[PDB]
Amino acid sequence: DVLDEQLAGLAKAHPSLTLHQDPVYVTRADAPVAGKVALLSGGGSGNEPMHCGYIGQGMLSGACPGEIFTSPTPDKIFECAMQVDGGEGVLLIIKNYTGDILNFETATELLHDSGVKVTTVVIDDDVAVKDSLYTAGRRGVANTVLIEKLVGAAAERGDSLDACAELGRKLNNQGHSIGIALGACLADNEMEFGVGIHGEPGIDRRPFSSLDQTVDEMFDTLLVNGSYHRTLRFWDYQQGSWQEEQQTKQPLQSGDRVIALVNNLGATPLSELYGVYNRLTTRCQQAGLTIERNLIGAYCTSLDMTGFSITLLKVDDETLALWDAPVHTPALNWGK
Amino acid sequence: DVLDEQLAGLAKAHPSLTLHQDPVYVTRADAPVAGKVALLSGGGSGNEPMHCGYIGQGMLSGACPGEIFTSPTPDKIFECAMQVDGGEGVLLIIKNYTGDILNFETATELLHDSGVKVTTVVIDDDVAVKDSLYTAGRRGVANTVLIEKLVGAAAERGDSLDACAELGRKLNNQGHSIGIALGACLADNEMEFGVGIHGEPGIDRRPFSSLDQTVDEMFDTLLVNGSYHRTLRFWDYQQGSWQEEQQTKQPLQSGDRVIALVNNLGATPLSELYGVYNRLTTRCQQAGLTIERNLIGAYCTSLDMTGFSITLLKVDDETLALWDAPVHTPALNWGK
């Protein structure tokens, strides 16, 4: 019952959302919104507000929650996508986990065969660990939030499915995240360095000496692990098939302008996140990175894990315009 | 250093805020704003985003943070008030703790003597305990956030100092809060029932059985402890003296329309607060209470305490209009 009660609570708190039953998924109350590319995501419960907190104008059209840390079944994704399609296509944003990849792929193929124009964006921003417990390649973590906002803004503006997907894929190649935990959702004064959002092990356990030193090593790891080459699969709706694409991320470098996300993994005092941000700006300025915009708070949690993550996303004038554009969701709200 | 770093991070993250030094306090960057009543609050650190997260158009003009769970010294309050005064006077919002009461009282007096038109609003919404560790009467807790927004909206509209204060005092008499904790910032499956935001003891320690049963008894206590008679002290700037006023709160009753705040005390998973809200709505509906607006998240924390509080505030059409009015702060943002 607890998950059901939680979802009923969400629907009651937010009349602008619609909680569907049999199967369970969540959409904007006004879905389908005709005339715009629809954005859809989803994944396990326990990462709230990701993704149901991001449903609204300028962001997601709908989301499909699964069981705790467990991919939604493909029926939820298929039915949600059908519900949100506004005739300009549906963009599926998928975090890189083996379950999520499998279920979103099953749904995507069937959607295409049912006449829905669809394609995909995979998120693999976590720089810490290659081939973790539930992931081939790198894990999809808090950069998903930033990409959902930016691609959400483009869709809301009227950009085509192809333009939205291309933007999503580009941003994914330019975003870098790392997380640490001081306690699971460890010995005294010890941290799990490079932790995942489903409790997966990091690079190692190591001493926690101070907040400042912890940020320093997270920041250093973003730079050192920033270069990354891998194959990602995307749906080509013209051909009606999966296409593999080899792509390379460049590390962040001097001259880069970034959006910074300092994210609470569940149980970190907010005061401490401002201390994290303080050290982050100093390391950014020293490395010739300009932080243009920031988000600080609980945007991609891991239940009640004690820890935090840092995400830096390279941006330009055009992406900043997309950032500044209106968003109206439970977790992010600004503009007219 | 760590407090200093956290405040530096805040100032870096939000250029709409100005961090002052010698003494330390925080104001809107555009303060003093001419032609509008200025709103000021403050208190110990450890309750973030209260109060620095509420600085901005439609809410606080400034805030005076103290040391952890410790009132700001009166020099901070005096100097902050001087800075923010826009020639229409300053309203000081004070949570009912002996330290805060003492320090804001010292500052208010000196402000009046220095030519600043000033008055005060005391918050004593916590229904759990009378005469706690650091409180004469009832503790001031999360309803402070609600009053800050509503009075903030009244001041921004151009209401006089007296109207703003009268609104503040009235809302204080119609707002009711209670909190529980499952872990300090307890035995197995035991909760501290009626905990305070500085870790003060509650009504007692009692079993935790389920989230629904906990909400039931929190809600029942709001009703049972709702009636309250006490003396509150306010600054009469016409007489230039402290004036005692005896006032009585009525309990919420069938027919009342309310704003609901479900508040994370620091380490409760967000999903769980929606579960709390689900049950709260059911009990409200059963009791003839109409929840008109809600806030769910971390608005008045107690460092990394595991627990939550529920606040219900009686409202009417006029107050709902003030709720819906624009607000632009780090922690609360909506409207044009």
Side-chain angles (χ1 to χ4, degrees):
Chain A
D1 311 59
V2 295
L3 211 80
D4 301 344
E5 291 163 19
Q6 292 172 1
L7 286 172
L10 174 79
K12 282 153 182 174
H14 302 286
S16 73
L17 307 188
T18 298
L19 176 62
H20 304 256
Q21 57 176 20
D22 300 325
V24 171
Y25 55 89
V26 188
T27 64
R28 292 172 60 174
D30 49 357
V33 181
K36 319 291 196 172
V37 171
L39 268 67
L40 180 160
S41 196
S45 287
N47 301 140
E48 295 85 5
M50 202 173 66
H51 298 267
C52 297
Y54 302 116
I55 298 165
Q57 189 181 22
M59 211 158 178
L60 297 177
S61 314
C64 297
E67 300 294 316
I68 291 303
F69 301 160
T70 315
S71 183
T73 46
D75 63 319
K76 293 174 167 185
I77 311 168
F78 181 81
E79 295 296 323
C80 191
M82 294 284 274
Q83 179 76 17
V84 300
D85 184 9
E88 301 304 319
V90 177
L91 186 58
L92 303 194
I93 293 169
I94 312 154
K95 289 187 294 287
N96 192 30
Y97 299 94
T98 54
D100 296 16
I101 294 303
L102 199 42
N103 293 353
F104 278 89
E105 281 189 355
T106 298
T108 302
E109 212 172 43
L110 232 212
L111 287 160
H112 172 100
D113 298 328
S114 310
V116 180
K117 190 167 82 188
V118 55
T119 193
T120 57
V121 176
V122 171
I123 319 292
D124 68 340
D125 56 313
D126 185 348
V127 309
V129 180
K130 186 197 158 189
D131 301 331
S132 196
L133 300 177
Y134 322 105
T135 294
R138 289 182 175 184
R139 294 171 304 206
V141 297
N143 199 42
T144 305
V145 181
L146 301 183
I147 294 177
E148 285 177 357
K149 162 73 173 93
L150 294 167
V151 178
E156 180 54 27
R157 174 170 74 185
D159 291 7
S160 66
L161 182 59
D162 290 332
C164 288
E166 277 168 36
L167 172 63
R169 296 177 195 147
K170 184 192 209 306
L171 295 172
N172 179 66
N173 287 319
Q174 274 175 32
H176 314 264
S177 301
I178 189 161
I180 72 90
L182 289 160
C185 69
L186 290 165
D188 322 64
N189 308 303
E190 184 167 61
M191 67 171 161
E192 188 72 30
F193 187 77
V195 79
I197 65 181
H198 304 135
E200 309 95 318
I203 300 164
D204 59 26
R205 291 166 190 175
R206 65 184 58 177
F208 178 84
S209 311
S210 69
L211 190 69
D212 277 350
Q213 290 164 278
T214 299
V215 172
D216 290 337
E217 57 180 317
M218 294 173 75
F219 181 84
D220 296 334
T221 302
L222 292 181
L223 298 182
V224 170
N225 286 22
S227 186
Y228 181 54
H229 70 87
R230 77 294 196 206
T231 297
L232 299 171
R233 232 149 87 106
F234 308 109
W235 186 258
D236 184 337
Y237 68 81
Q238 298 290 359
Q239 290 200 44
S241 60
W242 295 111
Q243 292 300 131
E244 303 204 312
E245 208 205 331
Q246 275 185 5
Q247 45 213 289
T248 308
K249 304 173 69 187
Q250 301 313 311
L252 294 162
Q253 57 172 25
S254 179
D256 286 346
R257 305 159 78 193
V258 298
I259 297 181
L261 167 52
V262 173
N263 173 62
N264 192 358
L265 291 175
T268 298
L270 179 61
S271 59
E272 290 180 17
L273 297 189
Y274 282 118
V276 169
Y277 189 75
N278 188 61
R279 187 59 179 161
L280 186 55
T281 58
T282 309
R283 297 301 310 273
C284 283
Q285 206 184 68
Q286 285 169 6
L289 309 178
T290 307
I291 302 174
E292 304 282 13
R293 305 286 184 279
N294 70 84
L295 268 190
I296 300 174
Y299 293 98
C300 176
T301 60
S302 176
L303 287 162
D304 62 347
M305 166 173 284
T306 297
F308 67 91
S309 67
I310 292 166
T311 294
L312 308 173
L313 172 62
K314 174 183 166 67
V315 297
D316 49 20
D317 283 9
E318 293 78 18
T319 22
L320 284 179
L322 293 172
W323 185 260
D324 295 336
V327 57
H328 300 295
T329 69
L332 281 188
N333 192 75
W334 60 78
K336 62 177 187 195
Chain B
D1 294 9
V2 300
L3 220 301
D4 298 351
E5 286 181 332
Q6 295 173 359
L7 285 169
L10 175 84
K12 292 169 181 158
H14 303 284
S16 70
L17 308 187
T18 300
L19 176 64
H20 303 256
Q21 317 282 21
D22 274 273
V24 173
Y25 56 88
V26 182
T27 67
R28 293 173 56 174
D30 56 357
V33 176
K36 296 171 181 307
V37 168
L39 259 72
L40 193 165
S41 191
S45 291
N47 300 136
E48 292 83 4
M50 207 175 56
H51 296 265
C52 293
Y54 302 120
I55 298 164
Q57 183 177 28
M59 214 156 179
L60 297 179
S61 303
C64 302
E67 301 294 316
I68 294 287
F69 302 152
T70 308
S71 179
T73 47
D75 61 317
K76 292 168 161 170
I77 312 158
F78 181 78
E79 290 302 318
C80 195
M82 297 282 272
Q83 181 71 55
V84 300
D85 186 3
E88 304 297 315
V90 181
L91 181 57
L92 308 163
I93 295 158
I94 313 155
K95 294 192 287 299
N96 194 34
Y97 299 95
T98 58
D100 301 37
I101 289 295
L102 233 48
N103 292 356
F104 279 86
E105 282 189 352
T106 298
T108 305
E109 270 213 323
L110 235 210
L111 284 167
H112 169 90
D113 293 328
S114 309
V116 180
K117 190 162 85 169
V118 52
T119 197
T120 58
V121 173
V122 178
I123 317 300
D124 65 352
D125 58 317
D126 186 346
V127 307
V129 190
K130 181 181 161 194
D131 306 321
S132 197
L133 290 189
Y134 321 114
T135 292
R138 286 180 172 189
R139 303 174 293 212
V141 298
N143 196 40
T144 306
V145 178
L146 299 185
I147 296 179
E148 281 176 357
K149 161 69 175 98
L150 295 159
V151 173
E156 177 60 21
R157 169 172 77 185
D159 296 0
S160 65
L161 178 61
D162 286 342
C164 286
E166 280 308 302
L167 176 64
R169 292 173 195 149
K170 178 211 253 261
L171 299 172
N172 183 60
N173 284 320
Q174 306 181 351
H176 313 264
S177 308
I178 191 178
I180 68 90
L182 297 167
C185 71
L186 286 163
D188 314 359
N189 304 306
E190 181 165 297
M191 59 168 170
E192 191 76 31
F193 188 75
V195 74
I197 64 178
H198 308 125
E200 311 95 311
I203 298 167
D204 59 33
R205 296 173 176 170
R206 59 180 67 179
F208 186 84
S209 172
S210 69
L211 196 74
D212 288 349
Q213 284 162 284
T214 301
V215 173
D216 284 337
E217 59 179 313
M218 289 172 73
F219 179 84
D220 296 337
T221 301
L222 289 185
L223 301 185
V224 166
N225 290 8
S227 182
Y228 184 48
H229 57 90
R230 81 299 196 197
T231 296
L232 299 173
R233 236 156 90 102
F234 304 109
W235 187 253
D236 188 329
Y237 65 82
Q238 219 100 80
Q239 295 197 51
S241 66
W242 293 110
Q243 195 58 38
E244 280 181 340
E245 203 202 337
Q246 206 157 77
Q247 40 207 289
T248 315
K249 307 177 66 193
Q250 300 310 316
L252 300 158
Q253 67 198 20
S254 196
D256 287 348
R257 311 153 72 190
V258 304
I259 297 175
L261 165 56
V262 179
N263 174 58
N264 184 18
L265 285 175
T268 301
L270 174 65
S271 51
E272 288 181 16
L273 299 183
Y274 284 117
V276 168
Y277 189 75
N278 190 60
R279 186 67 190 166
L280 182 57
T281 53
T282 303
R283 296 302 307 276
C284 278
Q285 183 275 141
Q286 288 175 6
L289 306 183
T290 305
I291 299 168
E292 297 286 11
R293 306 288 184 275
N294 71 84
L295 270 189
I296 301 167
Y299 293 99
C300 180
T301 57
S302 183
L303 289 165
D304 61 342
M305 166 174 273
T306 310
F308 68 91
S309 68
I310 293 170
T311 292
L312 302 180
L313 177 59
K314 174 179 166 62
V315 297
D316 50 31
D317 287 346
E318 289 74 13
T319 300
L320 287 171
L322 292 167
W323 186 256
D324 294 338
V327 60
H328 300 297
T329 67
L332 285 181
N333 189 77
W334 61 77
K336 47 153 267 184

